[PDB]
Ligand binder design. Structure first.
Ligand SMILES: O=c1ccn([C@H]2C[C@H](O)[C@@H](COP(=O)(O)O)O2)c(=O)[nH]1
Ligand SMILES: O=c1ccn([C@H]2C[C@H](O)[C@@H](COP(=O)(O)O)O2)c(=O)[nH]1
Ligand SMILES: [K+]
Ligand SMILES: [K+]
Lengths: 316, 316
């Protein structure tokens, strides 16, 4: 089936992954270097052996294309994937007069009481961002997230670059260019950042009228992460290809440190006893063509019939 | 935030604007009568939810203050905002021996071939204006543009009036005058003109040592137009106030027909999902005080961090 590459990755890491430590001291089985390709003409690679919320992905990917960097848009679509990073900034803010939220990540996980006080501060934080225009601007703005690196890369001269905007044109004018690249990795920022980009840089390629894309990911969470990562990028391949009026091609996913947190072994094994089903199909608005102006209703998933979801703990 | 007034205008026109036809048959959503104020002590109102080229504005506004009316100055600063109106005159000129450029506006938009021949004639036109002193004088001179109405209004007696020059003095001698007005609207010209002034007339006001300005705009393009219009006039408020040695006040923008071309609906909606960021600041040369003698380097924008630009078609 279409998803086999991922399943094979799970087995490979369970089979020859060596024990390697990580920043959260949770332990992982690692492998360095790996590549799997997906033929998007055979179907959309959204794992059927485990329910993956396409909503969260699409609303987050559009967030990126808009070049946005503020959480307010995500909370507007009930997307909490980036909350923690913003919250962290409100907490260490001198305007913060409330309970000590130092290292809330681990504390909430162990202490069941902190898990309530931490969920109250968050619930109201998301509220301020959502209603207090100024608060939103002040804390809801992450700043150095994918949206601004893709569409507002800062020059030494003082201005900004629309990498993706520019690349999309070179595809229409010079489809055979071996320089259809976008980079989220900037050396003068990386060391200051909390989480330097996992999705380092990607490349587009065009032959026989088909658009293919390769993604270099410096680090990967096999269980929780990869499922979303595969879908974000294969969807992008589709949108970019839609604007350029090209046929869809292949999504090549290359890896640096593909790892598996140890607290996921049972959950990963259980998914492997599952047999993939036929893959779903993507349906994009035929009329509308400016992908940068696309909204939810413009992108729709068809025939997704996934197995029941699989719960697991987040390494923090 | 500072820019909210404009965002509210976009929503209002999307909400209660009735369908009204226009000269370009492109269709617009109109509203008659509206007013928004900007407190310039809170920051410069240059939209952050969309990148707006401050360069084009400043170089065009100085063009006005110099009382100039010839395009050569604009092309000297790579400003093509007024090219079309001059080009039109070269085209219908009997000295014009080249391809039929009748109604180039629509033809270039639809026909992709005309869009190249039209771009060649223009490229060389801008060249003649730029090098052939006589050609410049002959076609590069628009004549009845803001620069001459502001600074060289023609009397029935035969001479000329420096409205702005005169008003600037009455501000220094009689700061409390309720007649600090400038008009670009002249009844004996209007019916012959291609595009009668959109920026009809403006008024200055002074209290507590602060200079405020009101602008009456008979017609407005919400998406493409207004962003530039807000910045031109708020910058003027600053310069005039600089010469008169006054504190900056409020910029009141009043409207006649504020409309939205239908081919901008998606682009306008996308901008509304964006959350404004803090506004930039203006920095004017402290030494130099004769605004009429100001040049680019004398006016500088600080901390402008706009969202990525938004492309859209020009109603023609
Ligand atoms: O979409 C995602 C989000 C996160 N991660 C993971 C990679 C790491 O597990 C952790 C970040 O810490 P590093 O191991 O990269 O240093 O987040 C992914 O693989 N994909
Ligand atoms: O800076 C500008 C330039 C142009 N326009 C618009 C107004 C109209 O959309 C068009 C001129 O035709 P009228 O609708 O005014 O007749 O140009 C503005 O609002 N602001
Ligand atoms: K780089
Ligand atoms: K008048």
């Amino acid at each position: 089936m279409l998803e086999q590459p991922y399943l094979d990755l799970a087995k490979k890491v369970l089979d020859e992954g060596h024990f390697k430590p990580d920043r959260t001291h949770t332990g992982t089985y690692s492998i360095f270097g790996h590549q799997m390709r997906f033929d998007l003409s055979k179907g959309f690679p959204l794992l059927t052996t485990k329910k993956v919320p396409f909503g969260l992905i699409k609303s987050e990917l559009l967030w990126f294309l808009h070049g946005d960097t503020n959480i307010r848009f995500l909370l507007q679509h009930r997307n909490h994937i980036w909350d923690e990073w913003a919250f962290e900034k409100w907490v260490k803010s001198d305007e913060y007069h409330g309970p000590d939220m130092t290292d809330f990540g681990h504390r909430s996980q162990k202490d069941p009481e902190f898990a309530a006080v931490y969920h109250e501060e968050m619930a109201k934080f998301d509220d301020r961002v959502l209603h207090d225009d100024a608060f939103a601007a002040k804390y809801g703005d992450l700043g150095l997230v994918y949206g601004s690196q893709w569409r507002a890369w800062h020059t030494s001269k003082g201005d900004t670059i629309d990498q993706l905007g520019d690349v999309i044109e070179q595809i229409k004018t010079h489809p055979y260019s071996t320089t259809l690249i976008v980079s989220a990795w900037n050396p003068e920022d990386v060391p200051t950042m909390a989480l330097p980009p996992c999705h380092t840089l990607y490349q587009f390629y065009v032959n026989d009228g088909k658009l293919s894309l390769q993604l270099y990911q410096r680090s990967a969470d096999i269980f929780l992460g990869v499922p979303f990562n595969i879908a974000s990028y294969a969807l992008l391949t589709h949108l970019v290809a839609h604007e350029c009026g090209l046929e869809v091609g292949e999504f090549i996913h290359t890896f640096g440190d593909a790892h598996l947190y140890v607290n996921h072994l049972d959950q990963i094994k259980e998914q492997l006893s599952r047999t993939p089903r036929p893959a779903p199909t993507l349906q994009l608005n035929p009329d509308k063509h400016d992908i940068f102006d696309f909204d939810m209703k413009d992108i729709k998933l068809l025939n997704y019939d996934p197995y029941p979801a699989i719960k697991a703990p987040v390494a923090v």
